Amino acid sequence: ATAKRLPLYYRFLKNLHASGKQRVSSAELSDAVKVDSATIRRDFSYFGALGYNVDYLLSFFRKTLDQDDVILIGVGNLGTAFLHYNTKISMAFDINESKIGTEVGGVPVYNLDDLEQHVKDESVAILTVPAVAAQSITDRLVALGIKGILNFTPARLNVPEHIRIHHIDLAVELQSLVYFLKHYS
Amino acid sequence: KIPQATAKRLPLYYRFLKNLHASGKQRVSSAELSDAVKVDSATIRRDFSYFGALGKKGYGYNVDYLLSFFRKTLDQDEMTDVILIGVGNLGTAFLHYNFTKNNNTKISMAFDINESKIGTEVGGVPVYNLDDLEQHVKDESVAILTVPAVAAQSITDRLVALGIKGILNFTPARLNVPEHIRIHHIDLAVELQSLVYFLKHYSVLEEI
Numbered sequence A: 001a002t003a004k005r006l007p008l009y010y011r012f013l014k015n016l017h018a019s020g021k022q023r024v025s026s027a028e029l030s031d032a033v034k035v036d037s038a039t040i041r042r043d044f045s046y047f048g049a050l051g052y053n054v055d056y057l058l059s060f061f062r063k064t065l066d067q068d069d070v071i072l073i074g075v076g077n078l079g080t081a082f083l084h085y086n087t088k089i090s091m092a093f094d095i096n097e098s099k100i101g102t103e104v105g106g107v108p109v110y111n112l113d114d115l116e117q118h119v120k121d122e123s124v125a126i127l128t129v130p131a132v133a134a135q136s137i138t139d140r141l142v143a144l145g146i147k148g149i150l151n152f153t154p155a156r157l158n159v160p161e162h163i164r165i166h167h168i169d170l171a172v173e174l175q176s177l178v179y180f181l182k183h184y185s
Numbered sequence B: 001k002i003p004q005a006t007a008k009r010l011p012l013y014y015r016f017l018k019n020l021h022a023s024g025k026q027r028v029s030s031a032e033l034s035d036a037v038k039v040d041s042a043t044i045r046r047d048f049s050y051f052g053a054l055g056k057k058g059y060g061y062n063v064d065y066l067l068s069f070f071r072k073t074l075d076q077d078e079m080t081d082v083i084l085i086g087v088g089n090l091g092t093a094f095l096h097y098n099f100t101k102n103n104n105t106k107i108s109m110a111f112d113i114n115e116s117k118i119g120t121e122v123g124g125v126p127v128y129n130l131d132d133l134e135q136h137v138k139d140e141s142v143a144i145l146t147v148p149a150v151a152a153q154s155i156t157d158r159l160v161a162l163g164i165k166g167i168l169n170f171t172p173a174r175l176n177v178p179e180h181i182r183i184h185h186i187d188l189a190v191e192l193q194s195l196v197y198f199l200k201h202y203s204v205l206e207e208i
């Protein structure tokens, strides 16, 4: 639970640091993030913060996050390239019963039907299915609390704005490069 | 070298012919062509020799023939033919990519070193031996790299020598190329690590 509160603090203190403030009280933080005074002080003791030093905490939060994941849907050429490319992909999903129940790149392939039961804490999804499948899958992912999607499909996804989408597409990349070549060469 | 002056006249001829064809006109003379682009009949003869356009004495030029001829010529000139190197998982996904018509871009050929793939067609694109790269590449300006990182640089040196001006690098290799060469580097692993980083830190990962 402490690690679910740490992000709330990190977000606010980032903002605080941005506005110049070198110190923060447990009451300031409580009002800003709606965690009670006492829980904050208890957490900050556990973080070794002895007025609290804003930079101490931000540095602590940042190191913690860096010291301590991902699912993939569509185990075809692109997905396999990803499962073989050289932050662990822990589970993959497909609809091909030939692939369901095998491991590719050491990662087990499950039935898409099991997505809701199997996904718990994972926050990142790689999407390597045909564009036609992408929106319905994305809708299910956002419902299961996935927070970022690597969309390696031609589909332009409809998502809440807080869902981070990294869109990778061959035609989109090529359009841009060709434009440069045709205009700035 | 088709002369610049000739090459610049090609879209002019085409626009003129477009209008003639819409008007129901069946034949066009050298003089009518000359009036259209403001040159003389001898220029038309020379320009048409450079384009390979054919007429019949007296009759002149068939408007339908010439319009489709000039359209086929402009389409080819404006098409982006792309070369792909490395027909593994990633490269075969790309050779199966369906580019829309609106987009005159296609992958025209591919190269590999695997004997089982060389001499085959994948998504309608022929797969050739990398050794023959210099004998297949003529005017193509864009290449896609989907080879292991350790092979990417030697290949890139060859491409830039053959006149490739732009590369999509889907490999981990950080490529060394002259200043004018345009590269987009897409490392799939790094793209994944970037998404994970942002969700932890709400700032964008510094790469390299």
Ligand SMILES: Nc1ncnc2c1ncn2[C@@H]1O[C@H](COP(=O)(O)OP(=O)(O)OP(=O)(O)O)[C@@H](O)[C@H]1O
Pocket (backbone or CB within 6 Å): A073, A074, A075, A076, A077, A078, A079, A093, A094, A095, A096, A112, A128, A129, A130, A133, B093, B096
């Ligand atoms: N609705 C879906 N949910 C999950 N996976 C899917 C869905 N539709 C397709 N896939 C999977 O996405 C992958 C990519 O689909 P695609 O049709 O491009 O196959 P592919 O890469 O050519 O590979 P293969 O030749 O092995 O089918 C395949 O493994 C396919 O089974």
Ligand SMILES: Nc1ncnc2c1ncn2[C@@H]1O[C@H](COP(=O)(O)OP(=O)(O)OP(=O)(O)O)[C@@H](O)[C@H]1O
Pocket (backbone or CB within 6 Å): A081, A084, B085, B086, B087, B088, B089, B090, B091, B111, B112, B113, B114, B117, B130, B146, B147, B148, B151
């Ligand atoms: N120097 C090279 N020039 C051209 N192709 C190469 C070169 N080196 C490796 N390749 C090819 O690049 C492609 C991608 O390499 P990789 O080792 O990732 O194979 P892969 O994606 O696992 O595909 P597959 O399972 O079909 O071998 C392969 O088709 C391989 O045969």
